[PDB]
Structure 1
């Protein structure tokens, strides 16, 4: 019953690989249910074509903002933003898919995939999914990041959907 979504990542047009995730809708519903419905394209907007604007080697990969493509907005399925579901799940290690909010109770479409144990985020960022396959794809696309987040190259979600 736990959704599984995927991302087909490209580096400057050239297809690179696939990254799937397991959405924990069992524990974090409104958040998980949110990510699934945007990974598919179930409303017209979603993550297809959007990119990872903020990648920081050894930390995480930020994406989910299809509107502004910088970090400003990005709408969810419930109009614009939504409250923090909970903090039951903690950023235990790399692969951990979490929401990239801007001050409590402001979750939209921005998420980040962890590339290391990031405990300091526990309690501030709503964890809701985890890379199932492709953590080596997220590693490659990580190399194309920097320190302030600037991408050394254009990383994109060339295609996305639900396989389960």
Structure 2
């Protein structure tokens, strides 16, 4: 019953590959539904065409700012920001999907995929999904990142949607 969404990733316009995500909708229903709807675009806006603006190898890939493309924008399907739903799930290793924010109850549309266990984020960032297929594609994304997060080529979500 947990939805699966996909991102087709492109590097400077060239296809790289596909990553799919299970959204733990049974445990964070409000958070998961935000991500799911932004991935299908069914509300009239969402992730298609947006970039991954911050990638730090051995740490995480961050994306989801589809309005300013640099970490300062984005919005949720609920409004400009929504609450921290719960912290049932922890940052247990690579492939965890977690919400970016700017302090308590400031979720929007930015998220990050962890490429390392990041336990110091537990109880601060809402975990809501996990890579199901294509962890190898995320590891490939990582090699375009840098220590300060700037990427060496443009990493975009060329297409996205729901698989099940």
| TM-score, shorter chain, exceeding 0.5 | yes
Tell me how far 1:104 sits from its aligned partner. Answer: 1.1
Tell me how far 1:93 sits from its aligned partner. Answer: 0.4
- Unaligned segments of structure 1, at least 5 residues: none
CA deviation string 1:120-159 (max 9, x = no partner): 1101000000000000000001100011110111000000
- Unaligned segments of structure 2, at least 5 residues: none
What is the count of residue pairs matched by the alignment? 164
Tell me how far 1:57 sits from its aligned partner. Answer: 0.2
> RMSD of aligned C-alpha atoms?
0.5
Q: Secondary structure of the equivalent of 1:137?
A: helix
Tell me how far 1:85 sits from its aligned partner. Answer: 0.4
CA deviation string 1:10-47 (max 9, x = no partner): 01000000000000000001100110000011112100
CA distance in structure 2 between the partners assigned to 1:155 and 1:72 by the alignment: 17
CA distance in structure 2 between the partners assigned to 1:144 and 1:104 by the alignment: 31
Q: Deviation above 2 Å: which 4+ runs of structure 1?
A: none
CA distance in structure 2 between the partners assigned to 1:62 and 1:42 by the alignment: 22
TM-score (normalised: structure 2): 0.99
CA deviation string 1:42-94 (max 9, x = no partner): 11210000000000000000000100111112011012110000101000000
TM-score (normalised: structure 1): 0.99
Q: Secondary structure of the equivalent of 2:31?
A: helix
* 1:137 aligned partner: 137
2:44 pairs with 1:27 = no
